[PDB]
Specification:
The structure is a homodimer. By secondary structure, the first copy, chain A, is of the alpha+beta class. Chain A has eight helices and 13 strands. The longest helix of chain A is centred in the C-terminal third of the chain and has 14 residues. One copy of the ligand *[C@@H](O)[C@H](C[C@@H]1CCNC1=O)NC(=O)[C@H](CC(C)C)NC(=O)O[C@H]1CC[C@H](CCC)CC1 binds next to β12 of chain B. The PDB classes it as hydrolase/inhibitor.
């Protein structure tokens, strides 16, 4: 049982390079539109307190250099939507996959295709944390890299990368340019607030551990939803709801372990730690696998 | 800092479905050859003790059904090379990337494109362990999935998946069909022997931790190569050689931390554990990042 990303080929064919002045970052080319972070128009001496409307007024279509491999694309229109720029180009991407834009919920996962200069470097799996940050791996030049899910043949884009927070975690927008969380695109230290653990995902992962033979943490206790949550609150775990219980139903069925029994085991793990033991090769409780992720990987 | 796989698009275009009888698994289609595990010719009542030469003699070209999406490929020749079958087909793969076959060394990493029925399901990063197993995520139907590295435009294929061992780890071949390690393709419980920790990779990861602000494990001690190795041997760590020291040179330079100083810190971690603390979000010492991986991800 592994942290697995979606195959990235459909997205690789959409990445381009966008340059305004000496600033370069990544854009996403779908149909005849290229989407990228609006701070591509900033110089280094703009990023502390940018007035994006005023900065963009000085820019014309020909100030945006868009490159797909050896080919320069011709920009024929531009507009700003929230924190993203949309550059209309004279060529529809022949590699455009079936796609949609979605705004994902906290607790859900997605794959990131980290890119530099329009070129894919690697792919990994992330969760949108309750506090609307992600724990990525991003360097200068990585903005405009995107997060996505694949649903059959269809790519659902849910994230575009914009910035780092003081804790080393990351923040960005949906593909309409609206940040996840309270963040703004300027070069200041910003607060994400308490991060809470995604309880339903921890339980999914404990189920995955059982499926994979690792079963030492199970016990002879059970609990109630209200009583577990008294312990969840204590550890900054999200409260568990009945909807979560029913989402875990299939995993509970495949293992024959009642959800509230697994909850009792989680309580003991939370209160007693792992006593140097491990679960699926980890000495920490993992919360970046959804139930759907766990079902996907054990089928 | 994240476990990151290579972008998988160039490999996605090479995966096909291979069916012999009711057995189906994955094949790799490059030029006019499809490569797949030879046990595609086995029935369930063959896999305990297969005589592959005798089984293959009963098979003709038209007994191999090869499907790339909606398209059936026509098999015009077949031969067995070690534990792989080579099916010559009447169509060269138009998506064949620049590629080569390499036999990778223990301690090196590669990306796995896990596939079922010829269709990519997900991508993750693995290491070839010292004992020539890998810790993958593979289900029935996953054989013929491949591991690879990408070097510029060129895909280096290094692994094809064949089996599970009793410890839940995995074993397979290079693309010439030669197993890594002592394993054979038959459905028996087989021994991998003691797994040792890839010391140079643990040090690379400790350097990555320093680069990423996490520095509590550093100390005021140093050591010698011989004296550390006395402690490496104890914990089933690979001995550190001067070649490893020089491989770590660049990371040592970027951090200004002498390799033998980092070794002294590792010794303390090995002898004292992590006292409930964490390193790059892990409560265990990670050994599946090479120095090159760490350089790649911090650039
Ligand atoms: C992409 O352009 C880039 C991505 C980050 C660079 C370092 N890692 C990243 O994730 N974004 C920025 O540089 C961004 C530009 C803004 C105008 C949107 N600025 C940014 O992330 O500034 C951060 C740097 C770290 C700092 C930490 C304080 C302790 C907070 C501001
Ligand atoms: C692909 O065909 C498949 C992959 C494995 C299935 C389960 N997980 C895998 O990695 N290979 C096999 O089924 C393989 C066929 C052989 C003829 C090569 N057999 C196999 O892996 O048998 C294993 C199953 C587990 C068992 C554990 C003993 C405690 C040892 C034999």
């Amino acid at each position: 049982f592994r942290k697995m990303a979606f195959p990235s080929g459909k997205v690789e064919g959409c990445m381009v390079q966008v340059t305004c002045g000496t600033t370069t970052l990544n854009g996403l080319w779908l149909d005849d539109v290229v989407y990228c972070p609006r701070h591509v128009i900033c110089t280094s001496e703009d990023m502390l307190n940018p007035n994006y409307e005023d900065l963009l007024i000085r820019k014309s279509n020909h100030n945006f250099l868009v490159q797909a491999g050896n080919v320069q694309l011709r920009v024929i229109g531009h507009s700003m939507q929230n924190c993203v720029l949309k550059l209309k180009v004279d060529t529809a991407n022949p590699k455009t996959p079936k796609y949609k834009f979605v705004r994902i919920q906290p607790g859900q996962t997605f794959s990131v295709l980290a890119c530099y200069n329009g070129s894919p470097s690697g792919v990994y799996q992330c969760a949108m944390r309750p506090n609307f940050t992600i724990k990525g791996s991003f360097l200068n030049g990585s903005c405009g890299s995107v997060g996505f899910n694949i649903d059959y043949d269809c790519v659902s884009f849910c994230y575009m990368h914009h910035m780092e927070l003081p804790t080393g975690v990351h923040a960005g927008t949906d593909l309409e340019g609206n940040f996840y969380g309270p963040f703004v695109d300027r070069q200041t230290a910003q607060a994400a607030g308490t991060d809470t653990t995604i309880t339903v995902n921890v339980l999914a992962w404990l189920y995955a551990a059982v499926i994979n033979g690792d079963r030492w943490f199970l016990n002879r206790f059970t609990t109630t939803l209200n009583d577990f949550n008294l312990v969840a609150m204590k550890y900054n775990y999200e409260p568990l709801t009945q909807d979560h219980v029913d989402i875990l139903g299939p995993l509970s069925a495949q293992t024959g372990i009642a959800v509230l029994d697994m909850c009792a085991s989680l309580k003991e793990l939370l209160q007693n730690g792992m006593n140097g033991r491990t679960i699926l090769g980890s000495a920490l409780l993992e919360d970046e696998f959804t139930p759907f992720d766990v079902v996907r990987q054990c089928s």
